[PDB]
Structure 1
Amino acid sequence: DLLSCLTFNGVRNHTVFSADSDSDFNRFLHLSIQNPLFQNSLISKPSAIILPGSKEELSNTIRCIRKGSWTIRLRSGGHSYEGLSYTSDTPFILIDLMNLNRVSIDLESETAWVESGSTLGELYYAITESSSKLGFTAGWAPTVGTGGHISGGGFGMMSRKYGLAADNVVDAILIDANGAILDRQAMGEDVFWAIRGGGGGVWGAIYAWKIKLLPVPEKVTVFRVTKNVAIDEATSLLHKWQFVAEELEEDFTLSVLGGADEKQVWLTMLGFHFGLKTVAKSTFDLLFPELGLVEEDYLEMSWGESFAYLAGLETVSQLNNRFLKFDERAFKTKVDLTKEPLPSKAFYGLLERLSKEPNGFIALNGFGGQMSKISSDFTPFPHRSGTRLMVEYIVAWNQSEQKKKTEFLDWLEKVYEFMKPFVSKNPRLGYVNHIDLDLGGIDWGNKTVVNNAIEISRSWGESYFLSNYERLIRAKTLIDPNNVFNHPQSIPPMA
């Protein structure tokens, strides 16, 4: 029936479920699974996979699915930390957007239309090919899809200068529950607000984003330096780092990745400056001489080169390869936002815990700069002025380490518990692109839960969106009153 409808409407790229492990179905399913944690045979699988190739095909795909009784799942880059783009407890149809990866750069307006299947890497590659003086602000990972990422905000190394990806969206095409093809004018300002950070898989299917391209100098300066130190020094480095980071002028970003193994602590310092190396080095010589950076650590390169470099890629060319796997390990990650400085003992304790679990690591970023100049309700992402740091805790493992899974997750749980007193409180804040089901989830098939959906959903909803939660609910009710686009943590519509 679904297939007949798709045919009648001219949608031809579809594949039904097959048990054959070598089937084209399985191949398409796995192409964009970015967390092996959700890859096994015991996980839910779609009844069919549809690959629309145009806005009309996307519209008609949604229309056909509604004539049946399916749960819609949209996938762009497949990076959902919780696999929410390709799993569902109820029978589902996977709409994979990988064929919608056209990027159209307009150098006369310095804007771009970006189909929502395009990855960050594909976008960055297109921009750098078009111009040496234009860039865009989004996350570091080149295989992340614009569909999920911009829908959830999109934070990266240029956010202190330019804010989130979603803060630089000026139009969009949204395909609603009825297949309507809506631009900014058609969807209205409440819905255009909601899609710019309110979370993917909730409002409809974004067909394309229109973004404003942003100035970058022809040469920027970066460094990636790993310090191999002991815990005393690592603690004092991290404790000073937090002040250096949040306070730097907007033309600088300094972030950290960290881990340990018994007495050996490693801290990888990632630096970016919107300018030349003489200024970059004079700034860090003055503000953070403890890092011990030398002249040869500072590299001058193009903006596109810098994004490939910070992502750990070999070349700018690799940005354009969406199936170059970032990593092959299963993972679980959690995040905190902070409002007060972290005491030294928090870093010491975090490092002690890392030293006992070499499969764990942390990633630390400062806000400030432009992030403090954007109002909390400009877009749905509310963590602006007053927000000091974002702290990510990750544990990752390979197949050979599978039996330690329970232990790894316990370690992460304990780290998050340890950090509780030092980070944001009442409520403990989160970030929707860092979706975390530990916070809870709605079973939309459970009537008693659905009756109280708004209160229940406030647990994660206010963590992600704070006061913006109320406006999100109104926008949801407007654009998807029948809740066609839903998942365990989707914004509830009013009854």
Structure 2
Amino acid sequence: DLLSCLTFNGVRNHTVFSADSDSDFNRFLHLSIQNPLFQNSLISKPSAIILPGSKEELSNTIRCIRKGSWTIRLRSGGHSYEGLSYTSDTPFILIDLMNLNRVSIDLESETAWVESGSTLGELYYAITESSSKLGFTAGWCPTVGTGGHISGGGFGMMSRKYGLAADNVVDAILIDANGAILDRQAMGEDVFWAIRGGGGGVWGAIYAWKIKLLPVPEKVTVFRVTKNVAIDEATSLLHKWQFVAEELEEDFTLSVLGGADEKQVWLTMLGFHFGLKTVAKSTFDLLFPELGLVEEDYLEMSWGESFAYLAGLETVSQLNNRFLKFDERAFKTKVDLTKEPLPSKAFYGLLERLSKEPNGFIALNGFGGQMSKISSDFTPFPHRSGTRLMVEYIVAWNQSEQKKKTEFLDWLEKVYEFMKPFVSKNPRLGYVNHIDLDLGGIDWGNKTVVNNAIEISRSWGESYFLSNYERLIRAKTLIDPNNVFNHPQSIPPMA
């Protein structure tokens, strides 16, 4: 019946569930699973997979699915930390957007239309190919899809200069629950606001984003330097880093990846300057001489090269490979946002815990700069002025380490508990692109829960969106009153 509808409407690229271990269905299913944690045979599988090739096919796909009794799941890059683009407790249809990966750059207006199956790397590659003086602000991981990423905000190495990816979206095409094809004018300002950070899988299916391309110099300066130190020095480095990072002028970003193993601590310093190396080094010589950076650490390169380099890719060309395996490990991650400086003992304790679990690592970013100049309600991401750091805790493992899964998860849980007193409180803040089901979830098939959905959902909702939660609920009711687009943490419509 679903197939007959799709055929009648000219949607041809689909595959039904097959039990065949290496069926084509299984190949398409796994192609974009980016967290192996959700790859095993015990996980829910789609009844069919549809690959629309145009906005019309996407529209008609949704229209057909509604005639039936299916849960819709949209997948762009498949990076959901909780696998929410390709799992469901109820029978579901997976709409995989990988064929919608066209990027159209308009050099006369310095904007681009980006189909939502496009990855960040594909976007960055397209931009660098078109111009040596344009770039875009989005995340660090190249295989992340624009569909989920921009829908949730999108923070990266240029966010201190230009804000989130979603802060630079000027139009969009949203396909709603009825298959309507809506641009910014059609969807209205509340819905256009909601889609720019309100979370993927909630408002409808984004077909394409229209973004403003942003100036970059023909040469930027970057460094990627790993310090191998002991805990005393690592603690003093991280404690000073937090001040340097938040306080740097907007033309600079200094971020950290860190981990340890008994007495050996490693800190990878990621630096970016919107300009030349003499200025870059003068700045860090003054503000952070403790890093011990030397001239040879500073590299001048194009913006495109810088984004490939900072992510550890071999070449700019690799940005354009959506199936390049960036990190093939099962993982779980949590995040904190901070409002007060972290005391030295917080870093010391975090490092002690990392030293006991070599499979764990942290990623540290400063806010400030343009992130403090954008109002908390400009887009749904509310963590602007007053927010000092974003701190990510990750534990990751390969298949040969699977028996330690429980131990790994316990470690992460204990790290998050340790950090509680030092980070944001009342509520403990989060980021919707860093979706965390530990906060809870709605079973939309449960009547008593659904009756109280707004209050229940406030637990994660206010963590992700603070005071923007209310407007999100109103936008949800306007664009998806029947809740066609739902998941355990989707914004509830009013009854």
Classify the TM-score, shorter chain: over 0.9
* CA–CA separation in structure 2 for the residues paired with 1:490 and 1:22: 33
How far did 1:370 drift? 0.1
Distance across 2 between alignment mates of 1:111 and 1:398: 40
* Secondary structure of 1:271's aligned partner: strand
SS across alignment from 2:268:
strand
Cα shift at 1:261:
0.4
SS at match of 2:108: coil
Alpha-carbon distance in 2 for matches of 1:117, 1:290: 43
1:360-404 CA distance string (max 9 Å, x none):
000000000000000000000000000000000000001110000
1:331 match: secondary structure? strand
| TM-aligned CA deviation for residue 286 of structure 1 | 0.1
SS in 2 for 1:84: coil
Offset at residue 158 of structure 1 (A): 0.1
Cα displacement string for residues 332-362 of structure 1 (whole angstroms, at most 9, x for unaligned residues): 0000000000000000000000000000000
Structure 2 CA distance, aligned partners of 1:308 and 1:267? 20
Alignment deviations for residues 225-246 of structure 1 (CA, whole Å, 9 cap, x no partner): 0000000000000000000000
**TM-superposed deviation, 1:489:** 0.1
Q: Aligned equivalents of 1:21 and 1:292: distance in 2?
A: 53
Q: CA deviation at 1:21?
A: 1.0
Q: Could you tell me how far apart the structure 1 residues matched to 2:324 and 2:261 are?
A: 29
* Cα distance per residue 1:79-121 (max 9 Å; x no partner): 0000000000000000000000000000000000000000000
- TM-score normalized by structure 2? 1.00
Give CA deviations for 1:302-337 in whole Å, capped at 9, x if unaligned: 000000001110000000000001111100000000
Q: What do the CA deviations read for 1:229-282 (whole angstroms, capped 9, x no partner)?
A: 000000000000000000000000000000000000000000000000000000
Give TM-score scaled by structure 1 length.
1.00
Runs of 4+ in structure 1 deviating by more than 2 angstroms, as ranges, are: none
CA–CA distance in 1 between the matches of 2:204 and 2:405?
35
Shift of 1:58: 0.1
Separation in 1 of the partners of 2:195 and 2:328? 31
Structure-1 residue corresponding to 2:372: 372
How far residue 208 of structure 1 moved from its aligned partner, in angstroms, is: 0.2
- Please give the secondary structure, in 2, of the residue aligned with 1:173: strand
* Deviation of the 1:216 alpha carbon: 0.0
For 1:138-217, what aligned pairs fall within 5 Å after superposition? 138-217=138-217
Structure 2 Cα separation of the partners of residues 441 and 310 of structure 1: 35
What is the 5 A alignment of 1:93-112?
93-112=93-112
For 1:22 and 1:392, the matched residues in 2 are separated by 36
1:72 Cα deviation after fit: 0.0
Residue deviations 1:33-74 (CA, integer Å, cap 9, x gap): 000000000000000000000000000000000000000000
Match in the other structure for 1:238 = 238
SS at match of 1:49: strand
| 2:153 aligned counterpart, secondary structure | coil
Q: In structure 2, what is the Cα distance between the partners aligned to 1:328 and 1:187?
A: 38
How far, CA to CA, are the matches of 1:320 and 1:42 in structure 2? 33
Give the Cα–Cα distance (whole angstroms) in 1 for the partners of residues 157 and 183 of structure 2.
29
2-structure distance, mates of 1:325, 1:266? 23
- Identity within the alignment, %: 100
For the residue of structure 2 that corresponds to 1:40, the secondary structure is coil
Work out the CA distance in 2 between the residues paired with 1:17 and 1:421. Answer: 47
Partners of 1:454 and 1:136 lie apart in 2 by 35
The CA deviation at 1:405 is 0.3
**CA-to-partner distance for each residue in 1:109-162, whole Å, 9 max, x for gaps?**
000000000000000000000000000000011100000000000000000000
User: For 1:375 and 1:327, how far apart are their aligned partners in 2?
Assistant: 35
Partner of 1:54: 54
User: Deviation string for 1:432-451 (max 9, x for gaps)?
Assistant: 00000000000000000000
Return the alpha-carbon distance in structure 2 between the equivalents of residues 355 and 316 of structure 1: 34
Is the partner of 1:332 in helix, strand or coil?
A: strand
Secondary structure of the 2:114 match is: strand
Measure, in 1, the Cα distance between the counterparts of 2:108 and 2:416: 48
1:411-446 Cα shifts (integer Å, max 9, x gaps): 000000000000000000000000000000000000
Measure the CA separation in 1 of the matches of 2:262 and 2:365. 25
- Per-residue Cα deviation, 1:427-486 (whole angstroms, up to 9, x for no partner): 000000000000000000000000000000000000000000000000000000000000
Distance in 2 of aligned mates of 1:343 and 1:177: 48
CA deviations 1:177-209 (Å, max 9, x no partner) are 000000000000000000000000000000000
User: 1:349: which partner in 2?
Assistant: 349
Matched residues in 1 for 2:102 and 2:399: separation? 35
Distance in 1, matches of 2:118 and 2:359, equals 31
Aligned length: 495
Aligned equivalents of 2:144, 2:81: Cα separation in 1: 11
Distance 2:489 2:325 in 1: 27
CA RMSD of aligned residues (A): 0.2
Q: CA deviation at 1:298?
A: 0.1
In 2, the alpha carbon distance for the partners of 1:415 and 1:387 equals 21
Structure 2 counterpart SS, 1:300: strand
Shift, 1:294, TM fit = 0.1
Residue 342 of structure 2: SS of its match in structure 1? coil
CA distance in structure 2 between the aligned counterparts of 1:187 and 1:167, rounded to whole angstroms: 18
1:16 equivalent to 2:16? Answer: yes
Task: Return the alpha-carbon distance in structure 2 between the equivalents of residues 299 and 221 of structure 1.
Answer: 5
Give the Cα separation in 1 of the matches to 2:323 and 2:449: 39
- Partners of 2:460 and 2:11 in 1: CA distance: 37
Structure 2 distance, partners of 1:221, 1:284, is 12
| SS of 1:284 mapped into structure 2 | helix
Structure 1 residues not aligned, in runs of 5+: none
1:469 is aligned to 2:462? no
Post-superposition Cα deviations, 1:21-41, rounded to whole Å, max 9, x if no partner, equal 110000000000000000000
CA distance in 2, matches of 1:272, 1:327: 23
SS of 2:228's equivalent in the other structure is strand
CA distance in 2 between partners of 1:246 and 1:270 (Å): 14
